[PDB]
Design a protein around this ligand. Sequence first.
Ligand SMILES: Cc1ncc(C[n+]2csc(CCOP(=O)(O)OP(=O)(O)O)c2C)c(N)n1
Ligand SMILES: Cc1ncc(C[n+]2csc(CCOP(=O)(O)OP(=O)(O)O)c2C)c(N)n1
Ligand SMILES: Cc1ncc(C[n+]2csc(CCOP(=O)(O)OP(=O)(O)O)c2C)c(N)n1
Ligand SMILES: [Mg+2]
Ligand SMILES: [Mg+2]
Ligand SMILES: [Mg+2]
Lengths: 535, 535, 535
Amino acid sequence: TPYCVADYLLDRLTDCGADHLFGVPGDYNLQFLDHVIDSPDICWVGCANELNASYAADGYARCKGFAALLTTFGVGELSAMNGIAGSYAEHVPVLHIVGAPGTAAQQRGELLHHTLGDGEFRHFYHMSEPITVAQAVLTEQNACYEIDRVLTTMLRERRPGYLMLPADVAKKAATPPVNALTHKQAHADSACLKAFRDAAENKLAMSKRTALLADFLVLRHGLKHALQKWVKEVPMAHATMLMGKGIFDERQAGFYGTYSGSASTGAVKEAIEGADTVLCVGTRFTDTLTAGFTHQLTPAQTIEVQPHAARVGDVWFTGIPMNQAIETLVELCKQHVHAPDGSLTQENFWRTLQTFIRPGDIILADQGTSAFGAIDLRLPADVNFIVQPLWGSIGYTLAAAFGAQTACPNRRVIVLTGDGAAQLTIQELGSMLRDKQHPIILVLNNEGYTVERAIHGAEQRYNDIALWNWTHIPQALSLDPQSECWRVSEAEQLADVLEKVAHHERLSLIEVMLPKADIPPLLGALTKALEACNN
Amino acid sequence: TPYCVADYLLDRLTDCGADHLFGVPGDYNLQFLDHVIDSPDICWVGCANELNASYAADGYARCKGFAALLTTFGVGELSAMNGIAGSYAEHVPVLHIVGAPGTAAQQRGELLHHTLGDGEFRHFYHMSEPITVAQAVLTEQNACYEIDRVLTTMLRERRPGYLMLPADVAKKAATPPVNALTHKQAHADSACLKAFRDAAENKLAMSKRTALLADFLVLRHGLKHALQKWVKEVPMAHATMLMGKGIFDERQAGFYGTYSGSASTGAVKEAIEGADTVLCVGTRFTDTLTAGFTHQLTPAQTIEVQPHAARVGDVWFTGIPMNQAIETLVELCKQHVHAPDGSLTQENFWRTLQTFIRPGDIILADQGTSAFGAIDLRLPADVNFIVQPLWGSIGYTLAAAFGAQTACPNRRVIVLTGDGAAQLTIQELGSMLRDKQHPIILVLNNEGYTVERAIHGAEQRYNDIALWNWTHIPQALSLDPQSECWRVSEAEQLADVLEKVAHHERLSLIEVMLPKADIPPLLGALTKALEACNN
Amino acid sequence: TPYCVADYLLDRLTDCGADHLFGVPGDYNLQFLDHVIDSPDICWVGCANELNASYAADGYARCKGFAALLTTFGVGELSAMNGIAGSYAEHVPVLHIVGAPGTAAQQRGELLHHTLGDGEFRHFYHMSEPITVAQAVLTEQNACYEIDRVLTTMLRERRPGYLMLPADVAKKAATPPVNALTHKQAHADSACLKAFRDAAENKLAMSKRTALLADFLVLRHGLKHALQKWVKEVPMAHATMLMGKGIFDERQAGFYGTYSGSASTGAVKEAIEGADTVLCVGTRFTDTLTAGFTHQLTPAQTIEVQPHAARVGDVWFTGIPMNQAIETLVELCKQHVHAPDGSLTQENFWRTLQTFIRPGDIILADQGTSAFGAIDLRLPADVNFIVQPLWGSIGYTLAAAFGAQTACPNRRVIVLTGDGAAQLTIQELGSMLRDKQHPIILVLNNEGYTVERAIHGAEQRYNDIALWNWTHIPQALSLDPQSECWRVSEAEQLADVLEKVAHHERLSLIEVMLPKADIPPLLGALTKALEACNN
Ligand SMILES: Cc1ncc(C[n+]2csc(CCOP(=O)(O)OP(=O)(O)O)c2C)c(N)n1
Ligand SMILES: Cc1ncc(C[n+]2csc(CCOP(=O)(O)OP(=O)(O)O)c2C)c(N)n1
Ligand SMILES: Cc1ncc(C[n+]2csc(CCOP(=O)(O)OP(=O)(O)O)c2C)c(N)n1
Ligand SMILES: [Mg+2]
Ligand SMILES: [Mg+2]
Ligand SMILES: [Mg+2]
């Protein structure tokens, strides 16, 4: 078992923060798989299909900051396309490793299985270029430094990477790295940082009131603590949008709720849009997050910081690391200080869930009523809120949850998913069972896609779905389900079963019966804007 | 004239070693052009067409290690494609800057001139991806760090880079860099270098005789001195192939001539192929350099070092910088010490030229009899030999020469070009005149493409060319040609004209009449192999 | 000499209307070249470089409706990129044939010359995809039907096509086609044509006055006669823009001059923009043709016909061939009837040229004062006016002229080119000489790029050019120039010389001395708009 490229790769995975590898075996990656099984630092996690695997890796990365996925040439990698795309869209560092035929076989252009039958082997590699920030075809001559390059680029941009690993290359000899792959992000040019500082100061110096608006990018770049500390030391109005929900303890002073354009509550709208200068940190104003771009923030009124550039008014200062810009803003901000029960409905359902969430929780909500209902949950401290509003691929959360549980075995995972969504990735529930995870899964059963009904064709057949018997799924995907299932239809029951599971001694699945047309407050707004675009 | 992106870019150009900018103006780059003219560090050099400009930049980069080209969107950039491609093929760091329409206009998808008329503005950018190692579309939010990224990647890989500079972005405010862009190439993993060292030692330790074979990559990575020093301290048989010709003083001990497979002389073939261990440094065995892949070197018999990886036998050690690998090899080597006149013809022409070349010369030879004749020149010290065997685009050398003169005003530039080749880039001779350069240009007039004739269809009309009156060209491309012209046909004539022009007090153009079918020794071999491929 | 793929290809070329093949030889296309030389239907035309060749083919196709270009892998094809792009931008059917290495050698991924040195052979093929409507890599199994498919697609869309011809494939056996490749463009769906007809009628039925505006697409689709006949039978105000100049006899009734937005004369602006319904046929409103999009034409006021779709008001009728739409419009229209100097200057130069042009002339004008001055020429009948306003690549017209002469040996070719422009493709003048063509070439010598000066930096060094001795160029690019040359500075001299060369018994080159800042009327407008975009 001499040390080889396969081992080098795994070592770099661990250096990056990954302790598991998701994926599904395939002819071309079996031998590589031996190495991951023999590795004492990487644990193999086989999934039901590669789409789920990619979702799982995404979830995992949202917990540990990095993840890896292993698929097989063609059939495996293409099945994961939507997953990687989502990771790229929401800045989630997922490494995609694809086992491929030997270099010699590829040169020969043979009619190998898992190919288009044309002797071409770079089709899928090129198809993956738009959804990765770095990729490479590993060869006997570039193996190690290419591996280090993509991984390094991944950590810098916080996005997916792609590595084609030909089976023979995996076996090639290599020597263990003396040093772990370093992150060490470069500092900003002092002069540029100064220019930014001066511009920011002049702006904040004349500001009557200042507000802070932060989103997902701060989560991706590990600046949560920086922001919590900031708002604690310098009290001010502060919020996040759906994507960044979870960076703040929403029970603290200065938090009036989650911001989402004109669809926000009057308090939030006032606290944020009302300030004469608002700091936008790691912010991305997508249509879903702003209720159709109805946010009232102007260039003059704002200061925004992005991963590698910051802006004050109309001027941009490129070449400034997000962390340094935030640091500068904190210093300046200290320099200008200023003074019931019954039948279940979306309404009472979210109200009940509110009294249930506890610190240290990991909550995932899928597209639809789940996500736009959960947006109103007032989160305690140390809770990881996982949602995917920009990419918005339904089915994601159930699989993502499996990934989160794998990353945090000792944290309570709450999965909020619609009945339509859960159908797309149901088989991963079988993986939760196999690995004996204890997540508390709530399926909002409203007999279909109510968000779609809300947008158009409420009574159209295409918004219906096969009606499943949810509570019986666990015993179908397992020979001995360490699970507990319930069908709830009354607020009381829901609250009842919630306390019975609040300590997750087993996988618990709760089928929550809800009205077909019942829609959360926010959702109505977003829904009316979407159909307005269709007309 | 506030400091802006345009200025930031130029400053980085100078940091990289460029003092000139080649190109041809265009609507979209005029404003940017102002900045280069006002810059005290960058000199603008307008050319006759973009193709020539790109060739000139390549030649310039082969002298100063870096160059920049400026063209206009669409019509300008595509005209330079072949040049950039050649730079990429032969590892020449040329930065291609293309002035483009404003970002707003591009978003609007307007029917602007220099477009395909479809509202798309990324076609040409994408078309340039295969021939650059890094590229970027500059925006108001990424300007500076993207500019530094491509330039940095260029210096690392020694290859072309591409920057699309929208006119409005050029005008955006920026702040001067406090520090010059650093190269600082990373060191190899001590463990990997060790493994390479041990493997190399075991191999060298049992070697009866060792030989050194170096090529162009050592020139590109600035290791010319390292190799000269090496061979001086550790005497051994050593050579280069056509591409790397010039790294060694071929008058020194251990040099028996240029290596080119079985087409080499018996002495060279024995000195190199005869050693039981041959060191291949920065080597690339192309068909033209090996006479149809007729080199007799085996894996076991060799040790090769590439830019980022080295090999001994069948084992590769990836992640080792070329300079460190050479350093290691030098240490280990010291541990194993082991003791004309008459009618002109290709024959007497090259013999004459041999007595003419002097140290400090810069010699350029185009594809055809020029290049395969010049390969036998025994070069003195400090001479820059410029040839392009891998890409092999005829016309290149005349324009490249202009670039070389621009970079080395005080060095004697000898241009060896065929009559067919000179026709493709003739107008750049007008630039030489305008800038009052004093090249000594020799046009081998054999009435056509004799190399092609040698390959196939010797008496075919397609190998003929319009017959020009070469000695009258200067007075056609200038109102006051600071030049001297000669039509030579006897070795004595050539001999005398060369003594006259020895100190290049003026541009001198020598039309050398040669036989239509006269071919140099080496060329016959290469020629027979090429047609063998056609059958 | 058994019939092979090479022969099949040539036969298809002739079927398409080509009698010549432009290009420059190369190792990989020599054997194919034998076939073209032996062909009694295709004449080989070797050029100075492949950029010029592609321009020549473009010009040729503008005369015969189809052309072919032959280059060599990598170095050849990339040099022609700008030409093919221009052809694609302006809808010129040029077939680009590139000779390539044998299929076996390509599969092997060898380090062949003219490659990037990575074993990849599809880079350039892919790079050419955005500028062609069809392309194919010829193989032993697809040769003939792929050849027919791209050619057919070319004829349909009137755009460039690409064929990679591996040397070995060219030698493969084939059988001569029984039938010539048919065009036979499909008819429109009767119901769709009816809907278009009814909509057009309702519009025309209430029109007080109707005007016709036609451009280059009618030229490309061979509908010149259809339009001339139209306007003759149904008298009405009619014009073309710069690109379509030449479709009409501008001396006839109803023609008030060339249309170009607000930069047009009051008469033209009134005749066209003044009608309540204007027919836009084969029209493309680019920025250069409309003086910065200053045309005053509204959707309700217009009816436009494109190659495969027509529009009336806001409704589009897709699936209607241009020729049928025109036919329908003609029928409906018939249903609604209604009631000297001394010192030379741009002014007196164009006035003089006006009295010189005669029916049957072929006039080419390059970008700059040439094109924007020639736009005011009142053209007689049967004159082919060649200009390239959309792509706008300078240097194009000199080479294109060579192509036009080749296609029309017995027509008088007038080349109007600036001194800046002619420098980029000057060597093709050598080809005109070699083939003994009798162009009458006028070089507007105003010491530089006056259009650029008019746009920005009038006194900037970057708008200057090497000053050439134009009248001495022919005797430099030929050993026996069958030509006459004159430097002209007075209007008297211009008229005189023009009378001497009227019957083009020889190549005649006229250097026309003009003021550095002298700009034509129209150009001032276009110039002010371009710099407005830079700010
Ligand atoms: C992969 C994928 N396919 C289709 C869609 C379109 N879509 C968005 S929401 C939705 C339905 C949501 O159904 P569900 O989970 O039932 O939500 P609820 O009725 O709870 O709102 C669909 C089909 C999507 N986002 N992703
Ligand atoms: C741009 C380009 N076009 C075509 C070729 C194919 N080619 C290789 S050598 C050659 C002719 C060389 O002519 P010349 O300079 O006359 O040389 P000689 O007769 O001295 O061998 C040609 C056309 C090429 N290398 N590059
Ligand atoms: C290949 C190419 N390079 C650069 C340009 C930008 N350009 C447009 S017009 C022009 C100068 C025109 O010079 P010239 O032929 O002298 O005309 P005049 O002075 O008659 O206007 C230039 C450089 C272009 N259109 N095409
Ligand atoms: Mg549902
Ligand atoms: Mg020659
Ligand atoms: Mg001019």
